[PDB]
Amino acid sequence: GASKLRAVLEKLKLSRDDISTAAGMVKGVVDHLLLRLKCDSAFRGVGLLNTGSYHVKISAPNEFDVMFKLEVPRIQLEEYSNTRAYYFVKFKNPLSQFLEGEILSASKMLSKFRKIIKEEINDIKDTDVIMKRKRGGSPAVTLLISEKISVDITLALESKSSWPASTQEGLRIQNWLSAKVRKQLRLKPFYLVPKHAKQEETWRLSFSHIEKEILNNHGKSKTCCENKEEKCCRKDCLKLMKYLLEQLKERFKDKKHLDKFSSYHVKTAFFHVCTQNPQDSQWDRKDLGLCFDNCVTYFLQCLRTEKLENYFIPEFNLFSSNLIDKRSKEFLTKQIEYERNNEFPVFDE
């Protein structure tokens, strides 16, 4: 049981250099775009947000996520219709061209963003890239690099203001990472990505920079995982949870039953389990089997109760029916429940 999970992690390490070399060209292309974008007055202050293990984030087997941040001077937010996560953007400048009255148009800003990138990909066709526009608005643009590697590029407005009121009861890390750290983290900027709600000129809050920071400095002890005496299995548990969902989606690709589920749901439930299990002694590497069952069991509870709170916006249920069919949640409950009750045969060789 424990050795089966260690074998999965060892197998996942086998592609460590196939995803390290892929991201090395993603970073090549992305820095190419970052300059062209800086020639435009609206995106002059654009920069790469630190969101991944490489600016380059990996959320799939071999497909990448990159965010472009844009320092937007003092912003005023108006919450869209009690959604707690979707907002209109206003001011109190080079983004003047994108207003529709007092509101910043996301679709307008997004469109010029695309026009700039589709020209850069096509003009220097001397680099083998094309782009397929996905449906979310986030991701803004998807680039296929040599018909194998995929990179999602997200535009995001940076606000150095205090976090909006919907987050004031979120980031419940006080018993785990401390109140000192929670105060430090909430003095950092927050981001807004163009996302329509289910359509409008709305923006959605994003804290992927905070997520990376609490994954890479994840212990109650400041020296967690910096020496042989303090090796926890937090990151391994999150890896196995992502891989469990990835493998299940493959198995049920015949009907795409599980297509509404995302590694973000798995990552969100894993942060709630860290809150629930705050001591590094609850994540001792030798207890991997038990720590993974703790993660799986909480995710099942979320599926069965149809409630997975956003870690930063607790009134935003990622598992609400507005977002995910009741039939799909019940489906995945049954499949994860089977996997757990039988020592995860999806991990068999």
Quick one: what does residue 91 bind among ligand YME, Zn ion, none, with the CB cut-off 5 to 8 Å set by partner type?
none
Please provide the size of the chain in residues.
Answer: 349
Q: 142: annotated binding-site residue?
A: no
As beta bridge partners, residue 317 has: 309
Least spacing, CB of residue 282 vs Zn ion, in Å: 11
Q: 206: annotated binding-site residue?
A: yes
Quick one: what does residue 129 bind among Zn ion, ligand YME, none, with the CB cut-off 5 to 8 Å set by partner type?
none
Coil, strand, or helix at residue 74? coil
Least spacing, CB of residue 241 vs ligand YME, in Å: 15
Coil, strand, or helix at residue 154? strand
Least spacing, CB of residue 138 vs ligand YME, in Å: 7
The token pair at 150 is 């995929």
Quick one: what does residue 85 bind among ligand YME, Zn ion, none, with the CB cut-off 5 to 8 Å set by partner type?
ligand YME
Phi, psi of 254 (to 5 degrees): -60, -35
Quick one: what does residue 224 bind among Zn ion, ligand YME, none, with the CB cut-off 5 to 8 Å set by partner type?
Zn ion
Could you tell me which residues come within 8 angstroms of residue 167 by beta carbon, excluding any fewer than 6 positions away?
186, 190, 205, 312, 313
Residue 8 or residue 66: which is nearer to ligand YME going by CB? 66
- Mask 209-228, x = binds Zn ion (CB under 5 A)? ----------x----xx---
State how far the Cα of 184 lies from the Cα of 190, in Å rounded to an integer: 13
Residue 41 or residue 223: which is nearer to Zn ion going by CB? 223
Q: What angle do CA 48, 160, 203 make, to 5 degrees?
A: 70
Binding-site size, Zn ion (CB under 5 A): 4
Least spacing, CB of residue 193 vs Zn ion, in Å: 30
Quick one: what does residue 137 bind among ligand YME, Zn ion, none, with the CB cut-off 5 to 8 Å set by partner type?
none
The token pair at 34 is 């970052």
Coil, strand, or helix at residue 27? helix
State how far the Cα of 339 lies from the Cα of 210, in Å rounded to an integer: 31
Q: In this structure, is the dihedral angle defined by the CA atoms of residues 56, 76, 71 and 110, taken in order, positive or negative?
A: positive
Binding residues for ATP: 53, 63-65, 208-211, 242, 263-267
Binding footprint of Zn ion on the chain (CB under 5 A): 219, 224-225, 232
Binding residues: 51, 53, 63-65, 152, 195, 204-211, 218, 224-225, 232, 242, 263-267
